[PDB]
Design a protein around this ligand. Structure first.
Ligand SMILES: C[S@@+](CC[C@H](N)C(=O)[O-])C[C@H]1O[C@@H](n2cnc3c(N)ncnc32)[C@H](O)[C@@H]1O
Ligand SMILES: [Zn+2]
Ligand SMILES: [Zn+2]
Ligand SMILES: [Zn+2]
Ligand SMILES: [Zn+2]
Ligand SMILES: [Zn+2]
Ligand SMILES: [Zn+2]
Ligand SMILES: [Zn+2]
Ligand SMILES: [Zn+2]
Lengths: 8, 481, 839
């Protein structure tokens, strides 16, 4: 599954 | 002398404060240098965060403790829009710089950067805009890629004020949200890509120098394919007539090409475009050469895969190539796991020739080959070892650790299997499905996901931007004493 | 020679492939480097020069410096405060949309589509409810593709096939020079293909026969066949290594060869004297539309496998039943009972008794055969004049050749079918509906109607004889124009309306009513004589306000003139667009038609769940025929009717209408509408949330200026905000892309010969523009084609031959009059009379 924002 | 071979090294790095403070995180999505300033002018670039536009001037310094960067302008888009796309333009009348900014609302905002005022707003798109690009052929032409799955072509010309939209790339060519829009240097070809996994090449008509009651709608692309990548495409670009593109979960930047496509040939009409008749075909092209022994001739060709590891599920990461006459072409890209990669395309060709000579010498002299760097003549080196010993000139930047490796390490001829393999991994192009290791891979402090890359007109500065409103400035040909 | 030895040679010939790639890549890389673009549009002076460091809102920027190879940060985290310049925007965005919304004159046919990507809604957290809601949705979309019982290819092998195909593309050029270098006896591409068909199985045994018909089975000696058998095994050992991703069998390479691939196409269209004619007209009888006369149109069935079954003669028994009846009609009219440019019969017999005549080829004798058959037992029309104009040959040659071959028709049996009594609910003679007719039939109830091919049986139109009109449905239905039964023999045959008035007639509310209005259908320009639809239904007479002020009021969709309307921002909360009246609309007037793509009930659900959201909704699906399952999707293609919003007490109302064997959606005014007002209709009990197998679908019950309005109005194409008082934009429908789509479809047909495609593409390019729906206007539009393309038609041998096949089919169908054939004769010989005058 895809992700656009970076994990904080 | 050997300065043409140097690659950037980290210089300055700034952490701009959090501008998007709604509980998602504030990130710098677009970095772009101003391209219309005269030669030699100190390079000026714009950095787009979710709600701000940072404008900096870079001036080379003799002191290694000094900051070359100076924020000459800082704008805040007062709205509810979360920006991400940006491009530069010029006032058609006064020639003053213009900065285009688009986000999740669907409008292109043209800012008069020097005066700190808003020039105009480009309305029409029915979804948020993800990419903006300026025609290299015309500084008033702007291409926008939106979530409405369409591309609008705009003209900031005085003749196109009442109706600035000169063209629409619609039809059924795309089915989901577009992520990348790219221009050809001729300003006539446009690349588009997005979530639908399709890469489309469109030919634009000539726009009249008069008022357009309605934009020219383009129903079909001239080349359309979803078979280059097996995932969503987030960055597409032209490199000559060659194509560079990247997709999610693939760890590569693919250098490929449309078979039969040449920007030296006449621009095809709208009625020359291939329409999708047989749906059991995921690639179609106007350009396809007629001569072939195969009923289905290959419409594209995968040439090389630039290995860009540790990206994973991360998308909306863009590469940028430095491609100026007289200088080396450098491909730069930052990954999702804090690393900035560099590839000098002038290196492949030199390696190819070096290896070809080495192979030929090995055969001709039965492995009795001595390799000497550039910096001594060939006919000079040949006299030292005499006849019966082959001498090959090796590019200075080639460093150790089909061509036979040395037997033992104390042997006067040949390199270790490990040295040759290390070299192959970075400069070999015999495998279309191979992975080219970065020529320079520079690490980053703390968690960093790369977003956009930007080179200064003379390729002395490389700015990479990303998560937590960060910008990493890399320098080449420094003045440090 | 042996398998192990051949495979050794291939391995060395294979090391050419990667050294060749390297040469190519490096070559293109040097070429693009040399052609690097020189920067343009440079300002003569630095425009930024004047600006200085900015170090009211204020924001933080912390700088850091780096040195060395590893780029070690020389810790100097120095932050400066910068003033912010707040630039608020003056312009508001337009209401949202998806896709370029294009205008289509009439409904267009669409292909059933598959999901070939992953629809990204938004970022889902690893091992969370949002992830489980999104992943289960994609598995449910995989279930819609599988429900069709279709080619369910998993992504595991999609990627694998893609990869293999890429490798096949790479090696394909190498095969011939490699074979040429090895010079093995019996190792030629043709022989390797010969071996492929023979040794199994991925080919149909039928396709195997075809490949072995093109090539032979002959590949002897028995040692030469050993060599071919050895090479295939040797190649697979080298390039088809089962443990590899970049894998490819020799079979796969040969499968894409130019002389092999056209056998596995899957894109196919299609008395001894008569048999020859049937074969000769094949393409025309199979593709040629009975409604619009095109060979590629928006009529016909798209089967689950995306293959088209056109509304052509083949749907109603082909040429033979329609023609046998023509001959019968001709021999019966016989009981009751012209000169041209290049010679004739009354002036010249067979010409001169001993005159030198060039030999006639098979194609010329063919043109004589099919024209004589389709004209048949005629009184007025004679083939020789027309065949003369087609073949170029003098008219007396066609007399001489006609006597030479002694042409004799098949005879036609006396088809005097006995008398049947009139239906208790429908009088076809007095043209009216009586008794419990609404309960008796389902002709008027389109929501429960199931499409079937018009009856073509030779017997009576009853259930006992097997007439579908009468027996296939839950109730009988009136026999329409395409049924082979005639009005004097069949009591179900619809004969039109007996309507006539000095004022307006064929109205929704009337002494004796209009059968057409009662049957929920428009008037037939042919059958509805003196009402008088023949003139009004014609779109060329569309803006004649004195013609439409009287007579036939039931041809609204056929005239295709819609009331002036504007696009704007809807008055309703978060609704986006809404359609607004640009003029005044009185009650009972036709406003607009709902046009879009013709899709199945299945395709509609597929699109709904593809485009839609789980974290949510917009739909442009309108039911056309609930029972047959045909829907109209106005998501990309259609007209401004796609923007009309919901309200229970609307001002307009949709109605499914039978418009010459075409089901169409019309909107009629149910209130008095003033300009600037917003148009609304009750969407129906199939659309969910509306406030002032399951798919959200709208249903039905079973010169000018920008108006003065409070809400903003936009241009449909440019999306520029129109200001009141300005001239109301009226952009003409651009069909070029749709004409292109149709030209290409024909071009992609394998079993269509180049000569055929040339005429078919030219006829269709011309005819698709006129949107013909009634045979009443074909003669007019036929004469325009034979006039406009007159010079094009004479200039080639194939073009005349092909044109005559079209003319033959239309004649056999009794759809093209006799008078129009001789007029076409005169325009063709005059066009050839000018070819010799300057050539
Ligand atoms: C056929 S489209 C009409 C055009 C649409 N309003 C637009 O902006 O393009 C129908 C859609 O409009 C919206 N809609 C129409 N009438 C509505 C109402 N009364 N209340 C809520 N939504 C409505 C729904 O989203 C529905 O799917
Ligand atoms: Zn048709
Ligand atoms: Zn004659
Ligand atoms: Zn019947
Ligand atoms: Zn019937
Ligand atoms: Zn009947
Ligand atoms: Zn009537
Ligand atoms: Zn009627
Ligand atoms: Zn009427």
């Amino acid at each position: 599954a895809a992700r656009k924002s970076a994990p904080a | 002398d050997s300065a043409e071979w140097e690659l950037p090294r980290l210089r300055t790095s700034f952490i701009f404060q959090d501008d998007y403070k709604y509980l998602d995180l504030a990130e710098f999505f677009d970095v772009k240098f101003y391209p219309y300033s005269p030669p030699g002018a100190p390079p000026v670039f714009a950095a787009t965060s979710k709600k701000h536009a940072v404008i900096c001037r870079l001036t080379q310094t003799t002191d290694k403790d000094a900051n070359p960067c100076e924020i000459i302008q800082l704008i805040r888009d007062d709205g509810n829009e979360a920006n991400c796309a940006s491009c530069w333009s010029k006032d058609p009348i006064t020639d003053q710089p213009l900065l285009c900014i688009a986000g999740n609302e669907g409008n292109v905002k043209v800012y008069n950067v020097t005066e700190g005022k808003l020039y105009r707003t480009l309305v029409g798109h029915g979804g948020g805009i993800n990419d903006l690009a300026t025609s290299p052929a015309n500084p008033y032409i702007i291409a926008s890629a939106s979530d409405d799955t369409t591309i609008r072509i705009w003209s900031l010309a005085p003749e196109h004020e009442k109706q600035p939209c000169v063209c629409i790339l619609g039809g059924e060519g795309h089915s989901y949200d577009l992520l990348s829009v790219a221009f050809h240097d001729n300003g006539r070809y446009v690349l588009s890509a997005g979530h639908d996994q399709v890469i489309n090449l469109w030919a634009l008509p000539e726009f009249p120098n008069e008022h357009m009651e309605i934009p020219i709608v383009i129903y079909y692309p001239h080349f359309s394919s979803s078979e280059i990548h097996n995932n969503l495409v987030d960055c597409v670009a032209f490199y000559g007539d060659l194509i560079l593109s990247r997709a999610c979960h693939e760890d590569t930047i693919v250098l490929w090409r449309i078979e039969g496509f040449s920007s030296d040939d006449p621009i095809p009409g709208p009625l020359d475009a291939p329409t999708p008749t047989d749906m059991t075909k995921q690639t179609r092209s106007y350009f396809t050469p007629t001569v072939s022994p195969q009923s289905r001739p290959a419409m594209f060709t995968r040439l090389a895969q630039f290995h860009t590891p540790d990206c994973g599920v991360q998308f909306f990461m863009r590469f940028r190539m430095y491609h100026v006459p007289g200088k080396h072409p450098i491909l730069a890209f930052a990954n999702a796991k804090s690393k900035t990669f560099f590839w000098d395309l002038a290196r492949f060709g030199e390696y190819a020739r070096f290896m070809a000579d080495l192979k030929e010498a090995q055969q001709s002299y039965n492995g009795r080959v001595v390799v000497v760097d550039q910096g001594i003549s060939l006919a000079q080196a040949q006299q030292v070892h005499g006849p019966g010993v082959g001498v090959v000139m090796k590019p200075a930047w080639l460093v150790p650790k089909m061509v036979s490796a040395s037997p033992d390490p104390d042997s006067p001829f040949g390199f270790s299997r490990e040295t040759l393999q290390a070299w192959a991994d970075m400069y070999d192009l015999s495998n279309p499905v191979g992975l080219i290791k970065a020529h320079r891979s520079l690490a980053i402090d703390g968690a960093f996901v790369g977003r956009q890359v930007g080179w200064s007109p003379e390729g002395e500065w490389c700015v990479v931007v990303g998560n937590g409103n960060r910008a990493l400035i890399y320098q080449r040909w420094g003045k440090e004493r | 020679w042996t398998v192990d030895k051949i495979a050794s040679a291939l391995s060395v010939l294979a090391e050419e492939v990667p050294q060749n790639h390297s040469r190519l890549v490096n070559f293109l890389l040097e070429e693009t480097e040399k052609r690097a673009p020189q920067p343009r549009h440079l300002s003569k002076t630095d425009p930024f020069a004047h600006m200085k460091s900015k170090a009211v809102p204020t924001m933080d920027v912390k700088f850091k410096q780096h040195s060395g190879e590893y780029g070690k940060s020389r810790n100097s985290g120095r932050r400066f405060q910068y003033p912010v310049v707040c630039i608020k925007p003056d312009r508001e965005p337009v209401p949202p949309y998806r896709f370029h919304h294009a205008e289509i004159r009439k409904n267009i046919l669409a292909l059933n589509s598959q999901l070939n990507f992953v629809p990204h809604l938004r970022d889902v957290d690893p091992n969370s409810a949002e992830e489980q809601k999104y992943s289960a949705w994609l598995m449910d979309l995989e279930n819609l593709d599988s429900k069709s019982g279709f080619k369910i290819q998993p992504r595991s092998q999609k990627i694998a096939k893609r990869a293999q195909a890429e490798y096949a593309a790479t090696l394909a050029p190498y095969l011939e020079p490699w074979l040429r270098k090895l010079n093995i006896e019996g190792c030629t591409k043709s022989n390797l293909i010969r071996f492929m068909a023979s040794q199994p199985d991925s080919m149909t045994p039928q396709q195997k026969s075809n490949l072995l018909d093109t090539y032979s089975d002959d590949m002897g000696s028995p040692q030469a066949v050993r060599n071919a058998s050895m090479f295939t095994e040797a190649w697979d050992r080298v390039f088809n290594d089962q443990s590899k991703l970049r894998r490819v069998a020799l079979r796969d390479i040969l499968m894409l060869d130019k002389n092999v691939e056209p056998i596995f196409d899957n894109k196919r269209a299609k008395e001894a004297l008569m048999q020859k004619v049937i074969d000769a007209l094949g393409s025309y009888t199979t593709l040629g539309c009975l409604i619009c006369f095109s060979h590629d149109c928006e009529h016909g069935e798209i089967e689950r496998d995306n293959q088209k079954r056109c509304f052509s003669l083949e749907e109603i028994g082909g040429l033979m039943p329609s023609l046998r009846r023509k001959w019968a009609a001709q021999i019966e009219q016989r009981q009751k009972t012209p000169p041209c440019r290049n010679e004739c019969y009354r002036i010249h017999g067979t010409g001169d008794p001993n005159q030198q005549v060039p030999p006639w080829s098979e194609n010329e004798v063919g043109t004589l055969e099919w024209m004589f058959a389709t004209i048949g037992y005629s009184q007025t029309l004679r083939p020789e004049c027309f065949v003369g104009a087609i073949l170029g040959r003098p008219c007396w040659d066609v007399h001489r050749k006609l006597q030479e071959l002694d042409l004799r028709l098949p005879p036609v049996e006396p088809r005097t079918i006995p008398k049947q009594k009139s239906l208790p609910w429908y009088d076809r003679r007095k043209k009216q509906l009586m008794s419990d007719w609404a309960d008796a039939t389902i002709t008027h109830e389109h929501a429960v109607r199931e499409l079937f091919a018009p009856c073509h049986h030779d017997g009576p139109c009853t259930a006992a004889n097997g007439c579908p009109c009468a027996s296939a449905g839950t109730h009988p239905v009136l026999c329409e124009r395409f049924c082979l039964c005639t009005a004097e023999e069949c009591p179900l045959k619809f004969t039109g309306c007996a309507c006539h008035s000095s004022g307006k007639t064929c109205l929704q509310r009337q002494g004796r009513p209009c059968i057409c209005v009662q049957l929920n259908r428009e008037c037939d320009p042919t059958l509805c004589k003196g009402c008088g639809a023949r003139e009004r239904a014609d779109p060329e007479n569309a803006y004649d306000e004195v013609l439409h002020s009287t007579g036939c009021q039931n041809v609204a969709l056929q005239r295709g003139a819609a009331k002036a309307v504007v696009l704007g921002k809807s008055q309703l909360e978060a609704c986006g667009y809404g359609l607004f009246a640009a003029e005044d609309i009185e009650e009972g007037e036709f406003v607009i038609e709902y046009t879009g793509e013709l899709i199945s009930h299945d395709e509609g659900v597929r699109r709904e769940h593809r485009r839609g959201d789980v974290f949510d909704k917009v739909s442009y699906l309108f039911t056309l025929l609930e029972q047959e399952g045909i829907w109209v999707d106005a998501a990309i293609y259609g007209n401004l009717s796609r923007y009309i919003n919901h309200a229970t007490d609307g001002n307009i109302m949709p109605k499914i209408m039978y418009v010459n064997h075409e089901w169409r959606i019309k909107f009629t005014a149910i209130k008095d509408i003033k300009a600037g007002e917003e148009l609304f209709f009750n969407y129906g009990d199939n659309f969910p949330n509306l406030t002032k197998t399951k798919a959200a679908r709208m249903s039905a019950p079973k010169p000018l200026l920008v108006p003065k309005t409070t809400q903003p109005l936009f241009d449909p194409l440019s999306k520029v905000q129109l200001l009141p008082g300005q001239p109301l934009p009226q952009h003409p429908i651009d069909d070029s892309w749709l004409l292109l789509k149709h030209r290409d479809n024909l071009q992609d047909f394998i079993d269509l010969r180049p000569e055929e495609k040339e005429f078919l593409q030219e006829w269709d390019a011309f005819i698709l523009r006129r949107h013909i729906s009634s045979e009443q206007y074909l003669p007019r539009y036929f004469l325009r084609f034979v006039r406009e393309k007159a010079d094009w038609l004479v200039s080639k041998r194939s073009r005349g031959e092909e044109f005559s096949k079209l003319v033959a089919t239309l004649l056999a169908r009794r759809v093209l009059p006799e008078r129009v054939v001789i007029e076409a004769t005169q325009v063709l010989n005059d066009a050839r009379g000018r070819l010799r005058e300057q050539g």
